[PDB]
Design a protein around this ligand. Structure first.
Ligand SMILES: [Ca+2]
Ligand SMILES: [Ca+2]
Length: 415
C-alpha cells in the first residue's frame, strides 16, 4: 500500500485504495450490539477479498429513535462515547485492531454538522447563548448564517457552530483520539454541505494530515441560489470545487447521478471519467450506500436513490476497472450474492494496476459503454451493455478475457 497526497495536496492516500463500506443501514437492528464483533470475525475475509480500507459506522453512540422508523445508526449521536448500538468501546478497539492487523485501514464516519442536542443523558452538554449552536444566531432558512457557515440538517435546531473555536477543537481532538486509540487510518466526512470545506482541510491537517479523507457532498445544482455559479454547473464541477477546498477526495455523486438518470453510455460523465487527472483522481466512486441503497431488514432500509437490479454488476465492473477510488457496499458483497463477482473484479483491478489517476478513454460507435483503461501494469478494455465484439475493434495489442458475465453484458479484457 502506497501513501501520499495527490500533486494538488488532496488526501487520496496514494490513489491505490479499494474501500469496503463496512455496514448497512439496519445493522443496529439486525445484529444488536454485535456488529463490531462481526467485523472482527470477518477481518481476515475482508482482507483476503482485496480491500485496502473499511469505512466504519459512526463510532459515536446514538440512542435516537423516531417513527417508517429508525434511530441509533450514528448520524444523530449524542456524545463521543463509543458504547453505542454497534458494540462496546472494547469491541470497537478489537475490531479496529483485527482489521488494521490484516492490512485493512480503518476509516471512521464522522458527523460534525449536528448532534442529538436534546438527549437527556450525555457527556457533551453545550448551553445556548455562547455561539455553540447554529440557532444561537438568527436562522431564516437553509443557508449559512452567523453561527454556521454551511447548510442545516432539517430544521437546524441541532446544527453545531463547527467554526466556533471550542467546537472546532472538540472535533479536532476527537479525530486525534480516533487515530491514537481506535486505529483510524482516515475519515469519511458526513453532510459536508453543512459546514465549510476548508474546515475539513484544517481538521485533517491538525489531526491526521497523511491519512485518507473522503467527504459526502450530496447537493445538486438546483439546490444553490440563482446567483451562485453552482446553480448552472455540472455535478462534477460542484463536487470538484468542494474537494479543492477540503483537500479531500469526494464521493462521485456525478457518477451516481448518471447511473440513476442517464444511460450506461453516459456513465463516462462522472467525475472519475474526467480526462484531467486532477479531476478524476479525487473521485470516490460507489454503487449504493446505506442512504441511497437498500439494506436488509425493516422497510428495506432507506433506498433513497437505489440502483436497479439489472445494472448492479455493470456498475461494479465500471467502478472497479476505472479511475477514482472505488467503494463496495457491504450488502452487495456479503448479503446479496455479488461477492464472487466483485472479488474477481478487485483482482482484475489490482493485477492491471488501475489506480485513481489511471487514464480512461471512451469509444464511440458501439452501444453501451466501451472504455480503454491504462493501468500501471496492464491495459483494460471494458464493455458494458455493449455490442462490441472483441477488444481489437477499439484497442491495439494482444488481449485475453478477464471477465465475462451477465450474458456478455459485462466483459473485461486485459493486455
Ligand atoms: Ca494507499
Ligand atoms: Ca450546518
Amino acid at each position: 500500500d502506497q501513501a501520499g497526497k495527490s500533486p494538488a495536496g488532496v488526501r487520496y492516500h496514494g490513489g491505490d485504495e479499494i474501500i469496503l463500506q463496512g455496514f448497512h443501514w439496519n445493522v443496529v437492528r439486525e445484529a444488536p450490539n454485535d456488529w463490531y464483533n462481526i467485523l472482527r470475525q470477518q477481518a481476515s475475509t475482508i482482507a483476503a477479498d482485496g480491500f485496502s480500507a473499511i469505512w466504519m459506522p459512526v463510532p459515536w453512540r446514538d440512542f435516537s429513535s423516531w417513527s417508517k422508523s429508525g434511530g441509533g445508526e450514528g448520524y444523530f449521536w449524542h456524545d463521543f462515547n463509543k458504547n453505542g448500538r454497534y458494540g462496546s468501546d472494547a469491541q470497537l478497539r478489537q475490531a479496529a485492531g483485527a482489521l488494521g492487523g490484516a492490512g485493512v485501514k480503518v476509516l471512521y464516519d464522522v458527523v460534525p454538522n449536528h448532534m442529538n442536542r436534546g438527549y437527556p443523558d450525555k457527556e457533551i452538554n453545550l448551553p445556548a447563548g455562547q455561539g455553540f449552536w447554529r440557532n444561537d444566531c438568527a436562522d431564516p432558512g437553509n443557508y449559512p448564517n452567523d453561527c454556521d457557515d454551511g447548510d442545516r440538517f432539517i430544521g437546524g435546531e441541532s446544527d453545531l457552530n463547527t467554526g466556533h473555536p471550542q467546537i472546532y477543537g472538540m472535533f479536532r481532538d476527537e479525530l486525534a483520539n480516533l487515530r491514537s486509540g481506535y486505529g483510524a487510518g482516515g475519515f469519511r466526512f458526513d453532510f459536508v454541505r453543512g459546514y465549510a470545506p476548508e474546515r475539513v482541510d484544517s481538521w485533517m491537517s491538525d489531526s491526521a494530515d497523511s491519512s485518507f479523507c473522503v467527504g459526502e457532498l450530496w447537493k445538486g445544482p438546483s439546490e444553490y441560489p440563482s446567483w451562485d455559479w453552482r446553480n448552472t454547473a455540472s455535478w462534477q464541477q460542484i463536487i470538484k470545487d468542494w474537494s479543492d477546498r477540503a483537500k479531500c477526495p469526494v464521493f462521485d455523486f456525478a457518477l451516481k447521478e448518471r447511473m440513476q438518470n442517464g444511460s450506461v453510455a453516459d456513465w463516462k460523465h462522472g467525475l472519475n471519467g474526467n480526462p484531467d487527472p486532477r479531476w478524476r483522481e479525487v473521485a470516490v466512486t460507489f454503487v449504493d450506500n446505506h442512504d441511497t441503497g437498500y439494506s436488509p431488514g425493516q422497510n428495506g432500509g432507506q433506498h433513497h436513490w437505489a440502483l436497479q437490479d439489472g445494472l448492479i454488476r455493470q456498475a461494479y465492473a465500471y467502478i472497479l476497472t476505472s479511475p477514482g477510488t472505488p467503494v463496495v457496499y457491504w450488502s452487495h458483497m456479503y448479503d446479496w450474492g455479488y461477492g464472487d463477482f466483485i472479488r474477481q473484479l478487485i483482482q482484475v483491478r489490482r493485477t492491471a494496476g488501475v489506480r485513481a489517476d489511471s487514464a480512461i478513454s471512451f469509444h464511440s460507435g458501439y452501444s453501451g459503454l466501451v472504455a480503454t483503461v491504462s493501468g500501471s501494469q496492464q491495459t483494460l478494455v471494458v464493455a458494458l451493455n455493449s455490442d462490441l465484439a472483441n477488444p481489437g475493434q477499439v484497442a491495439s495489442g494482444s488481449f485475453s478475457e478477464a471477465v465475462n458475465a451477465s450474458n456478455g453484458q459485462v466483459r473485461v479484457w486485459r493486455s
